[PDB]
Design a protein around this ligand. Structure first.
Ligand code: NI
Length: 443
């Protein structure tokens, strides 16, 4: 009778659809699949010689494990190329330094076996780096966190990076899956000086004609302040800007510093960070450190989805995959549904369904381990917001939410959803201002 969720643990999930099935590939050579994005089936969980994705993995990827001095793999991407085969961009990292290698493996079938084609990037060397100059982690990337994608003109690209020298994009050979020659680490999009920015992902939206670069700010752990951000560009390889028109290219921590959160915070649209709808007298959903996302555009239905992992209030470091639907606002920026996907769609909303009291989450613009708390507001029939904040609300057309709060104009959507914690239907809104600040309302 009610939505059924079956949970899986896939860190850094990278979504791929093939033959009517969705798969996510993550770190530690973990993977899961689903037909409906709600009920997931765990397929693999860890690197070992009995992992079916890569038979005898420690021999198959011997060189990568040797360079990285690790027994595991970090965030994988799988992408199907024109030859119909599946290309896995694998990587490993020592973890205490950007000592890493990235390579590609290929499989006839989605669930493997994947066979190594070779390493094509390294970082953390003492001498000459991939761009011809000696390796410097303040300006050169850690060669991890790949996501490979086609642009609107059939060109193949790979964006990648975590911390260290920043986020880079490489143009790739559509026939071999390897980078085209003579690019070094490729073209820098942002980052440097050990900025807490990783997990880059690009999704082209045909309806707005923008490429959207999703990013994770902060650290992935429960005290890390992980949050999902986004910027956009006319071209796949930049330049990228945020909602205020800040160029992302200059976003980085100060020279001579490590993990300068204060310098990067003001840049990029912040879609989601730690939050809870729960109060002393009411249960509610809540995430700690949501991040490392991929995204999927469904060509049949036209809907978009954010796929990520998250931790949870009170549950330490345990993580699960979550899916939230994305909607494009008037300004051409996405907003996330406040609740995980349960088959909802943008339907007609009537003003009679909107008026009432809402719990309000303001995700803000910071990198903070502080779990955002709700405040109460009222959306009144006279098209005014009153309560712990004030302004005006109006429904544009079918379900577009034009809301003003604290003298700032927000745009997004009204959306009826399922609350899987309270197990009730809720009216929600999800909106975003020109400063890239996101607000969630739940009634
Ligand atoms: Ni990723």
């Amino acid at each position: 009778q009610k939505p059924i969720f079956k949970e899986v643990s896939v860190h850094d999930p990278s979504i791929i659809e093939t033959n009517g099935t969705f798969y996510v590939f993550g770190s530690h050579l973990a993977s899961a699949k689903s037909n409906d994005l709600m009920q997931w089936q765990q397929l693999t969980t860890s690197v070992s010689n009995d992992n079916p994705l890569i038979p005898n993995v420690y021999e198959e990827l011997k060189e990568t494990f040797e360079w990285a001095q690790s027994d595991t793999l970090w965030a994988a991407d799988v992408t199907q190329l024109a030859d119909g085969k599946y290309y896995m961009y694998y990587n490993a990292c020592r973890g205490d330094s950007p000592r890493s290698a990235m390579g590609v493996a290929v499989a006839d079938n989605i669930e493997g076996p994947y066979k190594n084609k070779g390493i094509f990037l390294k970082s953390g060397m003492e001498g000459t780096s991939s761009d011809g100059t000696p390796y410097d982690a303040t300006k050169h990337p850690n060669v991890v966190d790949p996501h490979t994608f086609f642009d609107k003109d059939g060109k193949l690209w790979m964006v990648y990076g975590s911390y260290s020298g920043g986020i880079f994009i490489l143009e790739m050979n559509p026939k071999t899956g390897f980078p085209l020659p003579g690019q070094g680490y490729g073209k820098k999009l942002l980052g440097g000086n050990h900025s807490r920015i990783e997990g880059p992902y690009v999704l082209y939206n045909p309806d707005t004609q923008y490429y959207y670069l999703y990013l994770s700010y902060g650290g992935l752990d429960a005290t890390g302040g992980y949050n999902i951000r986004v910027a956009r560009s006319k071209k796949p390889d930049g330049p990228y800007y945020d909602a205020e028109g800040n160029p992302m290219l200059d976003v980085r921590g100060k020279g001579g510093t490590f993990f300068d959160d204060r310098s990067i915070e003001p840049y990029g649209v912040k879609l989601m960070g730690s939050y809870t709808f729960e109060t002393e007298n009411e249960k509610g959903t809540g995430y700690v450190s949501p991040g490392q996302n991929s995204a999927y555009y469904d060509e049949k239905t036209g809907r978009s989805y954010l796929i990520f992992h998250t931790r949870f209030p009170g549950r330490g470091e345990e993580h699960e995959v979550r899916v939230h639907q994305l909607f494009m606002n008037k300004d051409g920026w996405p907003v996330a549904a406040p609740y995980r996907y349960a088959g909802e769609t943008l339907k007609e909303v009537k003003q009679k369904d909107i008026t009432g009291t809402y719990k309000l989450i303001q995700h803000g613009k910071d990198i903070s381990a502080d779990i955002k708390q709700t405040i109460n507001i009222q959306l009144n029939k006279n098209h005014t917001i009153s309560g712990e904040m004030t302004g005006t609300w109006r429904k544009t057309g079918k379900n577009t939410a034009d809301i003003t709060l604290a003298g700032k104009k927000y745009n997004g959507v009204f959306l009826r959803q399922w609350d899987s914690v309270r197990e009730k239907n809720v009216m929600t809104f999800s909106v975003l201002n020109t400063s890239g600040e996101a607000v969630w309302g739940s009634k």
